């Protein structure tokens, strides 16, 4: 029952290896091959070793020579084998694009069998494996996503030299005696009470020896004893069915912040003439999900019975695959810190080590197939990804049973896409929907995350209408153009394009002439944009951050308003599908952000960038995500409450108020007496009239607050009373143009304000620390210090991530205060004390020790 992971290979291209026979004898010379740990592409292996300058910097990437990388590359171990009374298995997946495995100078498979990334393979060498030394060599092919059921990294990037390919999960070696276990799961269902669960275990065992035996499955389902009894034939399988257990009161499984997120423990032998053989542990979570069309066509999800509005972003692993479980975690817990639910993951499916730590934190997951390469390419017309052949079909399905056999015990799980993009055809859906049977894998299936019906399935209830670069507030707000992307139905991938990172993340990724073009002329290329010609450039942001925002007269310009532009666009994306999800006719049933964070250092589609700095886009989020919110409608000027929480609330008040640059109050409303129900639900506090004598460029300050007097959300909008206005009619597939635009260029002469600042921390025994930063106006004027930003730095200034704010980028009229809070893990100080740099729009930079 012994399964150990092969901790590391030493890599060489096949250019310097003659003889492939060779590799895998034990006593190979490997003198000048590349040592590398488990999980490793190529050129992540390369990176590890000196080997080529941070592609995380500059066109560092581009000066990589990639012909090395059109033959294959050698994975090669020793493993010391004590005894060979126990059989010996090589059990793995993650193969980019496929690979001939030799065992001790034999070759056990070839290329034509262990092909596709998400394949498994389960390769029995006992007839290959003796005493003392053995070495294991895989031949990995170069990996092309257009030809191979592969990962690629289509116009999110740019192009890894490598195009990944490697080993990027582990290779199992597993040992057992004549019966193998293997497929271990639980079918879980959940009465509507969620009261009571039925729990049916299966389980294969495959009795690889010459001899016909009895083996006993055995063990425990969460908590309860079961066994079974069954007859091999000698290279007989057979699925072992176990009698139905009932559970209850099952500690079910939520979503975070709707109840806990509890998994229960499978673990089982399979025992022979009275001695365990081979054994498997597992977990699985009692939940229910369901996602259905509504009577408007857009998909609705629900978890346990309750309907959920989907609130996430499109998530993506490294740029080169490089797998940290820590980072991973820190990752998800972001999506928890941004108040988001749910993440997308289009391709690049990640290891199991991922969906526990989603199960263990309660995020959504919503994995599938990618567009615009091989697994859409028969479907496609002219895309990039090439026709499919006959051998295409069984490497497709063996795929999805692979994928539904790792992903069906995981409760984060939610869906499967099939298709993105284009819906697959009869025939190759046919084959999904058949693995998915096959591997009991029993959660809804979308067709695609377009409109794009599949045959069989049928409707997606998703839209994919773009936009993916520039649009301003008010366009998320529409619901007149059907072939759009404002709030309603489910906005599968979608955002404004171009997000900025911090300063910090800029200076370490971009050189000084690189930067100084970015700002003085967005239409040039950037390396860190990407490889598409549509999504090369910052014209389209550039263009709309003069016009709207005014002239950058710098660098320091030109970031301080990409922070205001995509906090005020982020924060509006989400705020109007939060509004519309409740609407009677065609409500918005999803929302992913494209995209929740990016492979490298990026100029585009993130919140979170790749050191896990926080910007405009960040915040913005995090401000529309907040369990009880207050927020003003860019359409129709109405305030409007949502509670994200899993219980109605009372007794709320939502105050309004308007104020010119000059700190001028214009507006006051104040609307007692407030309800809102649970999970989505909203209630209009006032619709704000015109206002005469309103400065150009004004402030608009939202206030709930609850039946206890407490501030539970603040929402600053900064306005003008010139209107965004669109060319519909100029509308392309990633972006509609706008024939009028607001005028917020007079927060260039917002007078200055104070802070007001004192910092404190206390190391904790979980290893974190806390810091704690209390706020406040200390002007002795009218005007409110405006769009203030706090971060935990070092003794050189340099920012401690990641981190984990309550709330910040905050705003507080004269005399106000607010505390704030910082977690983040005491190591990553890495011995420095602890400080907190403070930036305001109008308020200056100061550091205080904290």
């Known amino acids: 029952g012994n399964a150990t992971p092969i901790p590391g290979y030493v890599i060489q291209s096949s250019a310097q290896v003659s003889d492939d026979s060779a590799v895998s004898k034990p006593g190979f010379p490997t003198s000048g091959w590349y040592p590398v740990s488990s999980r490793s592409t190529v050129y992540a292996g390369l990176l590890q070793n000196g080997k080529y300058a941070d592609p995380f910097y500059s066109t560092n990437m581009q000066n990589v020579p990639a012909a090395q990388f059109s033959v294959p590359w050698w994975y090669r171990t020793d493993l010391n084998v004590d005894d060979t009374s126990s059989r010996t298995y090589l059990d793995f997946s993650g193969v980019l694009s496929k690979a001939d495995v030799w065992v001790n100078g034999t070759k056990v498979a070839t290329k034509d069998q262990v092909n596709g990334a998400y394949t498994r393979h389960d390769l029995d060498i006992t007839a290959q494996v003796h005493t003392g030394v053995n070495s294991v060599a895989f031949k990995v092919y170069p990996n092309d996503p257009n030809r191979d059921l592969s990962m690629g990294w289509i116009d999110w990037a740019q192009t890894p030299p490598d195009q990944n390919m490697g080993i990027v999960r582990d290779v199992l070696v597993r040992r057992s005696g004549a019966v193998a276990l293997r497929s271990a799961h639980v079918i879980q269902k959940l009465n509507s009470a969620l009261d009571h669960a039925d729990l049916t275990v299966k389980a294969d065992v495959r009795n690889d020896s010459a001899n016909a035996v009895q083996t006993t499955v055995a063990g425990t389902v969460a908590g309860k004893p079961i066994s079974q009894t069954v007859s091999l034939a000698a290279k007989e399988r057979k699925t072992v069915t176990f009698p139905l257990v009932g559970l209850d009161r099952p500690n079910v499984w939520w979503p975070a912040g709707m109840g806990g997120q509890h998994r229960y423990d499978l673990d089982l032998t399979a025992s022979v003439g009275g001695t365990p053989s081979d054994a498997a542990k597992s977990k699985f979570g009692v939940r229910d999900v369901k996602a259905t069309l509504n009577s408007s066509g857009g998909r609705q999800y629900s978890v346990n019975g309750k309907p959920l509005l989907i609130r996430g972003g499109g998530y993506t692993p490294d740029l080169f695959l490089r797998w940290n479980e820590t980072a991973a975690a820190d990752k998800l817990k972001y999506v928890l810190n941004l108040g988001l639910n749910t993440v997308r993951l289009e391709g690049h499916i990640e290891p199991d080590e991922f969906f526990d730590i989603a199960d263990d934190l309660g995020v959504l997951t919503m994995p599938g197939w990618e567009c615009c390469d091989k697994w859409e390419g028969q479907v496609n017309g002219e895309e990039k990804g090439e026709p499919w052949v006959e051998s295409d079909y069984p490497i497709a399905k063996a795929s999805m049973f692979s994928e539904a056999e790792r992903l069906r015990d995981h409760p984060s799980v939610i869906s499967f896409h099939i298709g993105s993009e284009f819906a697959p055809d009869r025939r190759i859906e046919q084959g999904y929907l058949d693995a998915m049977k096959a591997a009991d894998f029993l959660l809804p299936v979308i067709p695609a995350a377009s409109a794009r019906p599949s045959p069989i399935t049928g409707a997606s209830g998703m839209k994919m209408n773009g936009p993916y670069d520039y649009v301003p507030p008010v366009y998320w707000y529409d619901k007149s153009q059907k072939d759009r992307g404002g709030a309603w139905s489910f906005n599968s991938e979608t955002s404004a394009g171009v997000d900025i990172p911090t300063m910090d993340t800029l200076k ?67 705020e109007s599908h939060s509004r519309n999800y409740t609407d009677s006719t065609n409500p918005s049933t999803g929302l992913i952000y494209w995209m929740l964070n990016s492979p490298w250092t990026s100029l585009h589609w993130q919140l979170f960038d790749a050191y896990m700095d926080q910007n405009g886009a960040y915040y913005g989020a995090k401000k529309a995500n907040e369990p009880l919110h207050i927020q003003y409608s860019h359409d129709n000027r109405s305030v409007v409450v949502i509670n994200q929480t899993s219980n109605a609330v009372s007794g709320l008040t939502a105050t309004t108020k308007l104020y010119n640059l000059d700190g001028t109050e214009k507006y006051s409303n104040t609307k007692t007496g407030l309800s809102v129900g649970a999970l989505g639900a909203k209630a209009t506090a006032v619709t704000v009239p015109a206002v005469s004598g309103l400065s150009t460029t004004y402030l608009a300050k939202n206030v709930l607050t609850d039946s206890s007097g407490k501030e539970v959300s603040r929402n600053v909008y900064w306005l003008s009373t010139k209107a965004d206005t669109l060319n519909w009619g100029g509308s392309d597939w990633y972006y509609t143009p706008q024939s009028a635009f607001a005028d917020l260029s007079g927060l260039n002469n917002l007078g200055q304000s104070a802070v007001g600042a004192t910092a404190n921390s206390v190391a904790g025994a979980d290893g974190t620390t806390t810091t704690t930063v209390t706020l406040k106006n200390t002007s002795g004027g009218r005007l409110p210090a405006f769009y203030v930003d706090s971060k935990v730095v070092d003794s050189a200034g340099k920012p401690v991530l990641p981190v984990e704010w309550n709330d910040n980028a905050v705003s507080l009229w004269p005399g106000e205060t607010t505390t704030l809070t910082a977690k983040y893990r005491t190591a990553d100080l890495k011995g420095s004390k602890p400080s907190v740099r403070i930036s305001g729009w109008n308020t200056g930079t100061q550091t205080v020790p904290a």
């Open 508 to 574: 370490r990724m971009m050189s000084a002439s690189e930067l100084d073009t970015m700002w003085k002329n967005p239409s040039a290329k950037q390396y860190h944009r990407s490889s598409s010609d549509t999504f090369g450039n910052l014209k389209l942001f550039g263009d709309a951050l003069t016009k709207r925002y005014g002239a950058s007269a710098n660098l320091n310009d030109f970031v301080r308003k990409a922070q205001l532009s995509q906090y005020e666009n982020v924060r509006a994306e989400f």
